[PDB]
Symmetry: C4
Subunit: 390 residues, 4 copies
């Protein structure tokens, strides 16, 4: 009988470097003989023995004949699939866990937990799966597209925590947190503080007592709402990050937003999921973030870091760590996960590189990875190498 | 040495929701690069560690060149194949267990048992397989298409029970039950009661002492013959279900059949295999059934439920639970199986969604799944998303 | 540490029935999307946990571009490959063990032993492989196409026995036997008796003290040379079978060969590998043989059996058991192997069904299987279902 | 908990024979249905239970649409992939370990260690991976294409040794050695002696105290620099081999280079990685080398051997052992690895057979293997069997 998964100290290191790239459409030529699935919202989650590359497929492949609708998000064909990290997600390589248009997954040291959301926008549903068995569900509370993270949930000692949210994308979406255990929701936490809008949270353990999240506000601010969940008391609390380096997209020039740490500024309506991961140290804490290069568009991607301080009250601009993707290459959703080494965890940042060619063609993505290893500075940037017209 | 499989209490819950969809032909475009097998009569069966998606292939794929004959049922090329639940049944993903045009399978907690039927219609044969070894056979008694369930057999404490049947589809087909153990038939039970016609039974444990089956009568009634097998004495007994919600197809308006619980009514010649599964509770019993939406055609699919009572004498109409498939989408064979969680069994209903385009083209099917999870009502319906002309 | 494999009593039963068919070219249409390997000389061998389908590929696939030369036998591209029994041997499904144009394999209860032959016809070489390591070799003695069985070698208590042969196909080819152990040849046996010609032997355990073989004589007789190897003393001895049902192809009418059990009769130059397997009983011994239906051509295939007696002196015609393949369907090489059940061995007969369309096109084969199971008579025959022009 | 890997005595034998060939492009016809990856610099490395076929892919396949650039070496798309030895490295069969344009790997008896190099030529990076976790990095010291072996690193008792090098290909490239343990570099050795140029080293254990390497000098000599690393003191030392059979390409006639063992002779600018492996004996040492057949071009490949002596001072010409590849067939990079049998190691020599058709088409390679087994002489040569125009 295996033991439960706990957050440990991150491995020694001080910089991020190009780790691996997964460009399934470098094989989808009309001339080729492969069949990569058309997907979006990819994310990596790892257990003690393996890392898995999850994603949301449109139950279609390239080359294929159902490209129409792949640019849309919610529908009755969307499914959450996954391949082992390092394998091209093809029709046969892949595994379909369930039907869903929003999802998350996390391993608890013993078994996998898959989360999926599907159903009518006004009464959607969150379905928990433990291994091969469907174990539970959660209903919509705001009755407007119940959705989840699009990144790994976080398990500790057997209890897993997962952010959920219901509401308008241009209005109010108060997020919620579910304390899931062995597939069954044993609790539902109501966060305190700034909650006008909080979705697509990238959560991770800052320690054995706290989980933090860098989220997305789609209608009020270019600042990223920041969650701090006290695992010990299952209580949460949110409030806009205070640094000058706004991590959302779109966003105004750094420092452009006048006022205290709670000022939303101009709506800058819209947003994007941002990478975020922790570097746990015996007496210090590293916080790595990623943000698109273009301020208005999803192009490029840079890495930031800030050791210690309270993101809630620290307005000091973050430290630039590197360019993971140039402005000529797509830089869309991003996320964090942590590989488990023998005695330490390895913080990494995955990046969704969408191949957008309009609604008239297929719409898929590549997944570039970057992990903490060694010292110095980020050396190389990433490219998908795909030519959509093939 | 593993221990034997026993039926346990179902997991807590009170509604069925869309679980997973397997549409292998969403990848069989002339333009694509995949190779899904052309099949029919799919069914899921699970062991303690995994669920497998079995089916009957025509040893052909799409796109391919042997579409002629795939709409026929019995032949020398038909084989029983299976992939793990969650994988697309393709030429390479699949495993061929044996040659057969009728089949069943069930895991006994230790090893898989595959059942296959093939041979001349007048002297067909039932072949039992235990793991990789061919272990036994059973001959035709009525000498007219010896056939079996097309759904999982049920094992308890090591002994597995399987319904078989021989006879005319428009005449008399007295079914039989085989008590198989470790691949060898240690008994053959002769059911009592209504037996003029009883085929394609969907059986499952109602408890540790009884196995129940919702079967098909192809020539006498629109009511479903109902089997109750006393596992403790290996004795059976059949008699037409008594509810007003006739579960066969075709069928007349509910309550249309005048008379007592034994009235067959108009022949309504023909039928279809219907889903059926048990929800075991400490002091109550849930019985879930499925029936096509159209009364005359195999279109649509709805879920029913009836807690307690004797289906043999209860004429009270079943309770509508939801629409798993609309009348615009194919709703063919259906069936039940139960996923094994750590401490409870999860009742599910699989549905065969055939892609019928006439005998002039390929004839294959998708498999939509629905499982008990959480409460409330069924939220979403299922679609194959396939456009046969591609 | 696993224990060594020993021959046990066969499972109870008294007839052979169609078990499984492997027609990889039912997916090689120019229109399809699969890639089955072009092969020949297939054979199945099983260990305690799995059966494997070995064969000799021309390192080519259908559809493909290297069909020229596939009808030839020996060459520098031929490799011995294998897939698990039940999987289609495709480019990706397959595993390449070594380069060879003649081969054999057998599992000893602990690890697999692969045998391969390749090299110049005048100085060919036999290479033994144990798992992933190349362990030994044996040189040509007659200096004319050193070749081996094309069926499984037989291991007992850890020592494996394998027939080898060197010589002209139309002249003298004295076969030899190698006692291999853990990959290394610890002995070389020189058979006694009739040895003018003895190749492609189908060997199997008649007991814990004797291995028997039905072989092929390519230039002297239509009778099959018969080997009896005393495992206990590692001594052999050969002499033409004495039944009237000649099992070679070509062959004259049964009983046509005048004289005693040693008469070769007319050369009937040429031959074919024939199926042969043992049915071990507490006090009786079943011997099953297969022979093409046509006397002059490789078409059709029938099953024979003879309980007890000495094939060396028994001239009584064998008992016809059934038609595994009609005269309209190809019936080429055949062979025997035995599946291992929990407490008994299951004798089976595999059949090579070649798709011969001349040297101007591809030349591949299907593998039909038949195993002992239950009683009565053989019910169905086998067909490849392949239309070479697709 | 498994124990550490140590070098043992090689298995008994005295000759090399054709073992296995991996020609993935025997399936890349425009007409076929397969997808082999376009690669280069292949190499095999084995652990106690399996051998893996690593290589450097251009993230492209045949047939495909990105053939331009595959003839170039360094780029942002190159990745180190690997399949189990015996499987065709296809898009789906393969696993991508990391992004790199130079690499190495070795198993330490417990877990795999993958090494990859990528980044700007002037500030490249060496990334160590232990299983699924990124563990360490090493920076460029000469600031000119930091690169590594292109063959397996060598682990002993848990510590693994890997040659690295930085410098000009036509100038000075002083190589370095990294003592890696559990993914982390615990030491960096600076070799003594001739070091003007030393790259692409083929290293292997000559004993439990010494690792030897046959390297490449790209700008000064046709003689192969020879490394001897004292594992016991982690000290190294290099000096040009002294035999008359120059093993580099290009090279002048044997014995053409006048002078003592340290004479570089004419630049013969350029080189190639050469095969080299040890045959450990109780009291003797076999050293096997390979060298292209043509003196000026990468065509053909022959095997050499020299028992005992000091390659540093022995000028006696090596003993010709055989022709693994004729002058009509490509003979490019070559390398050594050792399969692990139950009680001994099996020395083998892999050969890279590039399919060069100019920069206007794809550029991929086949991998022919040869291993020590039995006695006598090398019997057969190897051919790719590929016709690039298909
Ligand atoms: N309002 C949103 N942020 N929605 C949203 C926006 C985008 C985009 O801008 O590209 C993509 C997907 C979604 N999503 C959906 O459409 C339903 C689920 C969800 C991703 O799983 C949001 O979590
Ligand atoms: N009389 C029947 N119910 N036969 C039957 C009917 C249909 C259909 O109406 O679609 C499909 C398959 C069968 N079957 C066969 O043709 C042989 C086996 C069997 C399914 O495995 C019946 O169990
Ligand atoms: N003389 C023979 N029997 N040779 C022979 C004949 C045929 C045939 O008639 O179809 C096929 C293969 C072979 N073989 C070869 O060509 C080399 C090896 C061997 C099969 O592995 C013979 O064992
Ligand atoms: N100077 C060299 N020897 N470079 C070199 C030469 C060739 C060739 O001549 O064919 C091929 C690859 C490389 N390589 C590169 O381009 C970067 C890494 C490396 C192989 O991994 C050299 O180790
Ligand atoms: C970040 C951190 O220190 N996490 C601790 C880990 O070191 C410890 O081994 C474990 C025990 O449950 O709890 C957690
Ligand atoms: C439905 C039901 O109660 N089934 C019982 C299960 O609870 C018990 O553990 C088992 C022991 O054999 O027998 C069965
Ligand atoms: C055919 C036969 O009887 N074979 C015997 C088997 O029953 C016995 O268990 C074994 C022990 O080594 O030896 C063999
Ligand atoms: C080449 C050689 O002799 N290697 C030795 C091996 O025999 C021994 O078993 C091992 C113990 O660590 O050390 C090494
Ligand atoms: Ca925003
Ligand atoms: Ca494939
Ligand atoms: Ca009916
Ligand atoms: Ca003959
Ligand atoms: Ca040189």
């Amino acid at each position: 009988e295996p033991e439960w998964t706990y957050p440990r100290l991150s491995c020694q290191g001080s910089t991020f470097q190009k780790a691996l790239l997964i460009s399934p459409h470098r094989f989808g030529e009309i001339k080729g003989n492969s069949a990569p699935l058309i997907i979006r919202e990819p994310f990596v989650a790892c257990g003690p023995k393996e890392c898995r590359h999850f994603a949301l497929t449109h139950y279609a492949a390239q080359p294929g004949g159902y490209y129409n609708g792949t640019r849309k998000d919610r529908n009755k064909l969307r499914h959450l699939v996954s391949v082992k990290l390092g394998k091209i997600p093809t029709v046969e390589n892949s595994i379909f866990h369930m039907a869903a248009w929003s999802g998350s997954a996390c391993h608890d040291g013993r078994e996998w937990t898959y989360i999926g959301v599907d159903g009518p926008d006004n009464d959607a549903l969150v379905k928990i799966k433990y291994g091969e068995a469907y174990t539970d569900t959660y209903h919509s509370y705001a009755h407007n597209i119940l959705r989840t993270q699009e990144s790994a949930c976080n398990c500790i000692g057997g209890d897993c925590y997962l952010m959920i949210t219901d509401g308008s994308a241009s209005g109010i979406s108060k997020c919620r947190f579910l304390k899931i255990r062995e597939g069954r929701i044993i609790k539902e936490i109501l966060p305190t503080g700034r909650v006008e809008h909080t979705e697509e949270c990238t959560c991770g353990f800052a320690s054995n007592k706290t989980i933090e999240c860098a989220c997305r506000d789609n209608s009020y601010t270019a600042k990223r709402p920041f969650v701090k969940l006290n695992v010990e008391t299952d209580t949460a609390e949110i409030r806009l990050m205070c640094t000058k380096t706004y991590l959302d997209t779109p966003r105004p020039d750094d420092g452009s937003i006048a006022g205290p740490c709670e000022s939303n500024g101009d709506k800058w309506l819209g947003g994007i999921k941002g990478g975020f991961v922790h570097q746990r140290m015996a007496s210090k804490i590293g916080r790595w973030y990623s943000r698109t290069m273009s301020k208005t568009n999803r192009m490029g991607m840079e890495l930031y870091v800030r050791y210690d301080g309270d993101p809630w009250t620290d307005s000091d601009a973050l430290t630039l760590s590197g360019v993971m993707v140039s402005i000529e290459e797509p830089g869309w959703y991003s996320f964090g996960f942590e590989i488990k080494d023998k005695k330490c965890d390895v913080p990494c940042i995955g990046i969704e590189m969408v191949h957008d060619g309009g609604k008239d063609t297929w719409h898929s993505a590549a997944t570039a990875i970057y992990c903490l290893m060694g010292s110095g500075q980020l050396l190389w940037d990433t490219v998908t190498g795909v030519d959509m017209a093939l």
